[PDB]
């Protein structure tokens, strides 16, 4: 009874990283075999469980949150860690416990012309609540002066984008993630 | 936080032996998991080890299983690679790379899945 992570994930486009997807996958187990349909080689990790446990293991409920982010920050996806992704885009707990899958998308998300699809965010007043979203888009206030919603001197947009060019070295090609949390 | 130093690395004749070690500070190596990679000129870094945290399983990639061993300290929190019988196509720097996660079989191989990583040591299989 494996969750179906290679049909939900069969798309086009993945989410980006600031308004990352939640899917929530019932009564399944998680089985890394599907992910071979997928892509020929991913991360494919745990914390606080190994992914052995998970073997014939069904649950009730399976949380996939999935985004596009460069492969050199693929290590921001992980309890405690610091920087732009994890501070301001996706955290994790302190304590999490569940799994980490991530795949080279460079084939599907790269463009000649440059895939500016894919944002993130880069400015922010603080860090983001471990699962919390951000979608706004207000100017981010960098000074002392108000930014009456332009961009300017001390006045950023809060997001760029990722670009993606096909011949970007491998860190700065798209990688496809998903996050598994669990509810036996 | 986490740091990892490793050394070791050396010239030495095809057919040598070198052991590498890498010095884990700041927290303590038990907790985390470890792999050996290695950077050849002109390459990616490449997989060659994994040690899982808590006493979890070993991995080997094909081209050094039987030649090479990785290994702990807990009294030293170091971890270690064993080389035998090394071959020119062994040459590279060598990296040693940490992370609290327990990883798949078939999962930590691409370095981009680590968090954390030494400054890397040489190591030159001369033929």
């Known amino acids: 009874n494996l969750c179906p992570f290679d049909e939900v994930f069969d798309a086009t486009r993945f989410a980006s990283v600031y308004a990352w997807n939640r899917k929530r996958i019932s009564n399944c187990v998680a089985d890394y075999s599907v992910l071979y349909n997928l892509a020929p080689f991913f991360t494919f990790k745990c914390y606080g469980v190994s992914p052995t446990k998970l073997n014939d293991l069904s649950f009730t409920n399976v949380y996939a949150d999935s985004f596009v982010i460069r492969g050199d920050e693929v290590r921001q996806i992980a309890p405690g860690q610091t920087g732009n992704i994890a501070d301001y885009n996706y955290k994790l707990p302190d304590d999490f416990t569940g799994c980490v899958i991530a795949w080279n998308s460079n084939k599907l998300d790269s463009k000649v012309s440059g895939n500016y699809n894919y944002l993130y965010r880069l400015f922010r007043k603080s860090n983001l609540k471990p699962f919390e979203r951000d979608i706004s888009t207000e100017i981010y206030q960098a000074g002392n002066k108000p930014c009456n919603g332009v961009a300017g001197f001390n006045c950023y947009f809060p997001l760029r984008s990722y670009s993606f060019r096909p011949t970007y070295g491998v860190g700065h090609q798209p990688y496809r993630v998903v996050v598994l949390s669990f509810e036996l | 936080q986490v740091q990892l130093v490793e050394s070791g690395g050396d010239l030495v004749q095809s057919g040598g032996s070198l052991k590498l070690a890498c010095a884990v500070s700041?927290?303590?190596?038990?907790?985390?998991?470890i792999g050996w990679f290695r950077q050849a000129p002109g390459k990616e870094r490449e997989a060659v080890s994994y040690?899982?945290?808590?006493?979890?399983?070993?991995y080997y990639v094909a081209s050094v299983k039987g030649r090479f061993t990785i290994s702990r300290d807990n009294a030293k929190n170091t971890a270690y690679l064993q080389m035998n019988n090394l071959k020119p196509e062994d040459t590279g720097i060598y990296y040693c790379?940490?992370?609290?996660?327990?990883?798949?079989?078939?999962?930590?191989?691409?370095?981009?899945?680590?968090?954390?990583w030494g400054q890397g040591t040489q190591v030159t299989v001369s033929s």
């Open positions: 790379a940490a992370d609290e996660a327990y990883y798949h079989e078939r999962g930590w191989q691409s370095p981009l899945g680590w968090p954390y």
């Open positions: 700041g927290v303590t190596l038990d907790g985390y998991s």
């Open positions: 040690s899982e945290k808590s006493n979890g399983p070993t």
